């Protein structure tokens, strides 16, 4: 049923809700981004082929030649991931691209059969992904962080609050392209419409319409609705739709085939418009003054002569109606104007804008584009076609086109790469409808308005940039000259593409280093979603309302995961079950519920599909065989809670464990804690360093099994088998012949490498823990990593907290520890270091490495080799020679006193300088291994022989072992041939193995079989000699080194970092504090058994720091370790296995409403003994998130451990021996060790080297420096009665050279005088003032 690693040991999971299919693969986001990018597409509208279709084919200006594209392929990598982890030279894979050259003819217009050539043109390098998930770049593993930007779409925004304080509501429209000019439409407070094409200056609305060759009547026909006014010889009669007089005062008597309907002065009410709709009145007699004052639409020309009586956008008068009546134009089509409901504002824009045709519009548009140029037509028209109607220079993001069609309410999800003329009209009509009050302003913080920038999409962007950086020169070389003898191989370059790729992968602010502290922080840094990037959410203009979490982030984005301070919660991380679709949005699964019957099938929902209907939550009570319990079930309706009936429930989630990320959900008691300390828990765990030898934790979740093997830190078995050999450096396996590959025998040899370096200076071991050969299968654990014990994560280890007040030592959130933590190397972390050697050629002499160094005694040279290198494992001390180095010296120019000393004593002091590698304030330790790089031109000179034989021992000897494993089956097949050929049973074991080919049998098929066996042995020898030469060739040629440098010697260290009495280390709920000095086991309290308290915490920290999970976590740890102590007490006697079996069965059936029925009766006796040896140190508990143990279970589970339901049993004093007045809990809980180590941050200086400008006394980490003070400390010291100690800090110890020169002489002679002189930084200030060209002086006193 379960895995064999869970047959070895298993824990208790309560599970008050039944679960469906568990956590998917954790790194599916980072891997699929590439799998959609590198892998070949048959339809080809994906990956690189999208760029190769968008750019290629390229057509030159002459048109006589072009370039065509077919496909691409990838080659095999030269170096492996292990050699690129050890040394590291640009781990990638070369790209192979075939191209064809098409040259047209001069006489024929389409002579494409003139010159057709096919060859290979090199592109550059493309880095692959170590499937574990690390970008391997030159020995330093990295990743890149996924971005979070606003994406191409048409959503709206409101402009209120600060600007336009008169009280005018103004909106705006923003069209978001992908590569081009960002389109902006905004409003005006005097009821107009503005256009800001790539915003620098405002433009009217109708100029972009008149630039598209539009007239006035076409605009008035498309946008406005036209009303025809008719005249029959005496009157004015109109064709009025009756639902148009809403909110208009009637100023005349309405007589339409009956009585007077509406009185003069009465507003049109509901029954009046109802009766006018029922009567179906076609013609309404309106008076003269109603039409006189309106605006006509068409240009009503004269039929007599042809002149313009009235034009468009002209106000009517009393004489104009008489002229139109005498002219015979009885079809006055007056525009319908409704100021309350409709918008006549584009007619006001036509009133403001004086432009008439396209020629008057394009001049103003081209002057708005680039001022300082005479206006032309062809250049402006070509600029318009390349900025608005182009495809190669203007892309529009087909997913964004689908979003355009969704926002404009269309039915076609596909589109072109250019802007059509109907889209602008539709978005202006939508903007007018929003201005009229029919629309709705979309908020920015929707999840449908942000698109995930993954690895592959940003790689597509960088590939497009690097290809536009080459294709211009490609077009120039096509239009350069002759084409017959010129080949396309020497035309397309390979430097800019690969250079842009390597500079983006090694210079971008998102491409940063990893965090090799603990693998949960590794997963955190993997699936991290940032907001800052190439023009994203800059923190200077950070969204004040964007920073607040949106209510649609329920189940998509983890609400609490950020570091406090400058990197505020804008940068987040996605949740557990949520993945990304191929469009680029977030989605989460929900299960199907059909008419109350809860089925099993699940489906994914997008961002815009959540706020439409009922989404149910997991804490509702569910019943057997499908139906519900309570009639009132709370759910989520459009982002709000509601209480309703049964049949309205549409969908439902699977379980609660999803709304937080993995770093929050590893905390089992998050549901009993406040959100602030649960936010603080994430950046308390993600900087934790594991110890040397930790144990199995107590309080975990069931999701520790995922983040394990699914992270990738443990060794994963490929297909299983039987383990043949077990060692602490190498393990092998014998795969069964049923699952064996049909080609040949496959043996999974594991060349595991221990103790590799990290850039956070951590120690990594992968701890081979397997026993002798057991049958293993797919998905097992073979190597427990540096923070895992038996597969699952062992981050730290549990202590015994008795939070009780002490004599001033547990004062304000501090920690008292015992002396038993030092004895068994508990809380011991190992920090290793990396150093390097330099050796560069000079103009007087190259650098050499000799052990013979002048003016150095033999006591410091006895630790070195004959070449001058410290032995492996030699105990180093600060002030010793690490790498011996001589340096050629020039001319000796000294004082005559030292020359007199040289003349008296008589030392020659030849030109050899002492520039050997020494450690400044050397932290002592142990050298791990010395790695020395060699030079192709310079002889290696005797040093790297031993590490060369070590590289030969990790070489072919393992291949010789694999060849011996294959040779065993080969000899078995030879024996199977020789037995079946003839009767040979006693004359084969006595003869040697090599004396078998000389035996000649009869002429039959066994002679051909023996010939094929001899040819197979010769083929195995010929295959062995190839990699026998090839491994030595790779070791020889794998020494690419920086120019101008001869050789580099690496020196490692190992400190092992014992416990200092002041550190930074805490629990999991965010109570960060400082451990005080170590009190012994004698002063600290104890119990009735005699065991002293291990650790003491803050007693008043509990009600003030609002942490509740601490107490029941302590009770669970105490009860579980009491159960483990009862198991140990049963183990102390040679006891019958039957009552132990009953004990384990009752301990697994202790829960009443518990799930996960343990298949316990099928274990053998040795498996029960191994389960007892595993549960020796306590049976661990597993409580899921947002589903906790009720206190009755805690009481009945600690009553099992012989406790009177209190947990506070008789702490005795260690100083006087008395008993306390009220007892304190002596329970057990779980805590972690952090990364903030004491002397790595602590540094202090006395002297050193000074800088250039104001001599700038250097400081920092590993620089031997100190601390300055700002102007705040200046104000603080001027707040006192102190006058010139601040002035001393200003000049004397800072920049006064003669001042500190006199000061050091006063201290070394015992004078203690200050004598202030002149600050040099003020002189630098005076010179910077005089560098401008104005006078400044010092008036003499």
């Amino acid at each position: 049923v379960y895995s064999y690693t869970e047959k070895k040991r298993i824990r208790k999971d309560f599970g008050k809700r039944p679960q469906v299919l568990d956590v998917p693969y954790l790194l599916s986001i980072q891997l699929d981004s590439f799998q959609k990018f590198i892998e070949q597409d048959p339809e080809g509208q994906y990956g690189l082929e999208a760029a190769f279709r968008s750019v290629f084919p390229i057509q030159s200006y002459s048109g006589n030649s072009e370039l065509q594209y077919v496909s691409y392929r990838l080659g095999e990598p030269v170096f492996d991931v292990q050699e690129c982890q050890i040394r590291g030279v640009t781990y990638s894979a070369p790209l192979r691209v075939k191209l064809r050259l098409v040259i047209y003819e001069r006489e024929a217009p389409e002579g494409t059969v003139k010159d057709i050539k096919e060859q290979e043109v090199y592109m550059g390098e493309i880095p692959l992904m170590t499937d574990n998930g690390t970008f391997v770049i030159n020995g330093t593993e990295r990743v890149i962080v996924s971005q979070l930007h606003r994406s191409p779409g048409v959503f709206f925004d409101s402009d209120k609050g600060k600007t336009h304080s008169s009280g005018k509501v103004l909106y705006n429209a923003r069209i978001i392209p992908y590569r081009g000019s960002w389109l902006d439409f905004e409003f005006d407070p005097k009821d107009n419409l503005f256009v800001r094409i790539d915003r620098r200056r405002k433009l009217p609305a109708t100029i972009i319409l008149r630039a598209l060759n539009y007239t006035t009547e076409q605009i008035l026909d498309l946008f406005f609705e036209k009303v025809i006014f008719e005249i029959r010889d005496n009157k004015l009669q109109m064709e009025l739709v009756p639902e148009r007089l809403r909110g208009e005062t009637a100023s005349f008597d309405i007589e339409a085939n009956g009585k007077v309907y509406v009185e003069k002065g009465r507003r049109i009410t509901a029954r009046h418009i109802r009766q006018l709709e029922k009567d179906d009145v076609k013609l309404i007699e309106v008076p003269v003054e109603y039409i006189a004052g309106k605006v006509v639409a068409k240009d009503y020309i004269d039929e007599s002569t042809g002149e313009l009586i009235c034009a468009a956008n002209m106000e009517l008068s009393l004489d104009l109606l008489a002229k139109l009546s005498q002219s015979g134009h009885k079809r006055i089509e007056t525009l319908f104007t409704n100021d309350l409901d409709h918008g006549p504002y584009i007619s006001e824009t036509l009133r403001v804008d004086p432009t008439n045709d396209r020629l008057s519009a394009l001049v103003e548009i081209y002057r708005m584009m680039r001022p300082g140029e005479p206006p032309t037509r062809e250049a402006a028209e070509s600029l318009f076609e390349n900025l608005f109607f182009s495809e190669d220079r203007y892309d529009l993001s087909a997913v964004g086109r689908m979003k355009f069609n969704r926002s404009l309410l269309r039915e076609e999800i596909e589109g072109s790469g250019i802007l059509s003329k109907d889209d602008i009209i539709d978005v202006m009509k939508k903007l007018i409808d929003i201005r009229n009050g029919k629309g709705e302003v979309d908020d920015i913080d929707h999840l449908g308005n942000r698109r995930i920038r993954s690895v592959g999409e940003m790689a597509e962007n960088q590939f497009r940039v690097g290809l536009v950086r080459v294709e211009r020169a490609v077009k120039e070389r096509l239009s350069l000259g002759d084409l017959d003898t010129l080949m396309p191989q020497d035309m397309i370059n390979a430097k800019p593409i690969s250079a842009a790729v390597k500079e983006f992968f090694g210079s971008s602010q998102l491409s940063q280093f990893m965090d090799q502290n603990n693998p949960l922080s590794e997963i955190t840094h993997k699936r991290r979603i940032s907001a800052l990037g190439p023009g994203g959410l800059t923190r200077e203009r950070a969204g004040f309302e964007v920073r607040d979490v949106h209510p649609t982030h329920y189940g998509r984005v983890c609400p609490i995961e950020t570091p406090e301070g400058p990197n505020i919660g804008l940068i987040n991380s996605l949740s557990v079950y949520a993945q990304t679709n191929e469009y680029g949005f977030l989605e989460t699964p929900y299960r199907k519920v059909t008419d109350g019957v809860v089925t099993d099938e699940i489906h994914y929902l997008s961002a815009i599909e959540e706020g439409n209907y009922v989404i149910a939550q997991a804490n509702s009570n569910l019943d057997e065989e499908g139906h519900f319990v309570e009639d009132l079930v709370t759910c989520r309706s459009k982002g709000e809670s509601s209480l309703f009936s049964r049949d309205q429930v549409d969908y439902m989630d699977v379980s609660t464990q999803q709304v937080v990320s993995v770093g929050a959900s590893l905390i089992p008691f998050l549901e009993h804690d406040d959100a602030n300390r649960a936010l603080m828990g994430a950046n308390m765990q993600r900087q934790a360093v594991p110890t040397l030898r930790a144990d199995k934790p107590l309080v975990g979740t069931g999701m520790e099994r995922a983040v394990a093997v699914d992270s990738g830190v443990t060794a994963v078995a490929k297909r299983g088998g039987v383990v043949q050999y077990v060692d602490a450096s190498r393990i092998v396996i014998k795969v069964n012949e049923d699952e064996m590959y049909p080609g040949e025998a496959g043996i999974d040899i594991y060349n595991l490498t221990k103790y590799t370096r990290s850039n956070q200076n951590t120690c990594i071991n992968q701890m081979p823990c397997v026993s002798l050969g057991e049958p293993v299968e797919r998905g097992d654990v073979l190597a427990d990593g540096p923070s895992t014990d038996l597969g699952e994560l062992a981050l730290g280890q549990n202590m015994r907290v008795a939070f009780m007040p002490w004599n001033g030592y547990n004062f304000e959130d501090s920690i008292l520890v015992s002396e038993r933590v030092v004895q068994e190397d508990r809380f011991t972390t190992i920090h290793i270091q990396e150093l390097a050697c330099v050796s560069r050629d000079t103009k007087l002499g190259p650098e050499e490495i000799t052990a013979d160094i002048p003016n150095v005694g033999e006591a410091a040279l006895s630790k070195l080799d004959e070449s001058g290198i410290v032995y492996i494992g030699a105990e180093v001390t600060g002030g010793d020679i690490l790498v011996g180095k001589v340096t050629p010296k020039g001319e000796t120019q000294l004082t005559p006193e030292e020359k007199l000393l040289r003349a008296i004593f008589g030392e020659k002091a030849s030109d050899v300088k002492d520039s050997s590698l020494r450690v400044p304030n050397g932290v002592s330790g142990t050298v791990i291994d010395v790695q020395v790089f060699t030079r192709d031109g310079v002889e290696k000179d005797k040093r790297a022989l031993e590490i060369e034989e070590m590289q030969l021992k990790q070489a072919k000897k393992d291949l010789s072992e694999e060849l011996q494993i294959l040779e065993a089956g080969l000899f078995s097949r030879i024996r199977a041939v020789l037995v079946a050929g003839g009767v040979e049973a006693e004359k084969l074991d006595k003869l040697p193995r090599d004396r078998w080919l000389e035996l000649g049998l009869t002429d039959e098929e066994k002679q051909n079989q023996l010939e094929q066996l001899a040819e197979q042995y010769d083929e195995l020898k010929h295959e062995f000699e190839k990699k026998l030469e090839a491994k030595r060739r790779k070791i020889t040629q794998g020494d690419d080194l920086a120019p101008g440098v001869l050789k580099i010697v690496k020196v490692y260290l190992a400190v092992k970092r014992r416990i200092q009495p002041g550190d930074k280390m805490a629990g999991r709920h965010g109570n960060k504090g400082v451990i005080s000095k170590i009190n012994p086991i004698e002063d600290m309290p104890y119990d009735e058994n005699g065991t002293p308290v291990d650790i003491v915490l803050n007693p008043l920290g509990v009600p003030s720091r609002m942490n509740i999970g601490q107490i029941l976590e302590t009770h669970l740890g105490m009860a579980a370790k009491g159960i483990g102590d009862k198991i140990n007490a049963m183990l102390k006697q040679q006891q019958e296995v039957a009552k132990l079996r009953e004990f384990i069965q009752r301990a697994y059936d202790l829960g009443a409403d518990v799930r996960q029925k343990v298949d316990l009766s099928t274990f053998s006796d040795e498996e029960v003994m191994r389960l007892a040896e595993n549960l020796r140190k306590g049976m661990p508990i597993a409580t899921p998130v947002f589903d906790g143990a009720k206190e009755a279970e805690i009481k009945e589970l600690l009553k099992l451990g012989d406790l009177p339901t209190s947990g506070q049993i008789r702490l005795y004093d260690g100083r006087t021996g008395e008993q306390f007045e009220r007892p304190v809990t002596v329970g057990y809980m779980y805590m972690l060790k952090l990364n903030h180590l004491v002397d790595d941050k602590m540094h202090a200086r006395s002297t050193g080297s000074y800088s250039l400008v104001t001599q700038q006394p250097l400081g920092g980490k590993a620089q031997f420096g100190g601390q300055r003070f700002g102007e705040m400390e200046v104000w603080a010291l001027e707040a006192y009665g102190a006058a010139y100690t601040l002035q001393e800090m200003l000049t004397v110890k800072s920049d006064d050279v003669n001042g500190r020169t006199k000061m050091y002489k006063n201290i070394v002679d015992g004078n203690h005088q200050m004598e202030p002189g002149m600050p040099e930084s003020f002189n630098v200030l005076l010179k910077e003032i005089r560098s401008l060209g104005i006078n400044i002086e010092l008036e003499d006193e």
Partner: protein, 50 residues
């Protein structure tokens, strides 16, 4: 908005109110992260003339 919490930190609360409480927690964290710059520039203003 209408419905408050029903349980407390001891009895255990649900997922919905826990999602609601983040709106008040992280907004206050943003306020105490951003208000210090203005307070510091004001206490710069007051000592600047002096």
């Amino acid at each position: 908005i209408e419905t408050p919490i029903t349980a407390n930190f001891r009895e255990g609360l649900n997922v919905l109110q826990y999602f609601i409480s983040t709106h008040g927690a992280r907004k206050g964290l943003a306020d105490t992260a951003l208000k210090t710059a203005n307070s510091g520039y004001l206490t710069r203003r007051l000592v600047d003339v002096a």
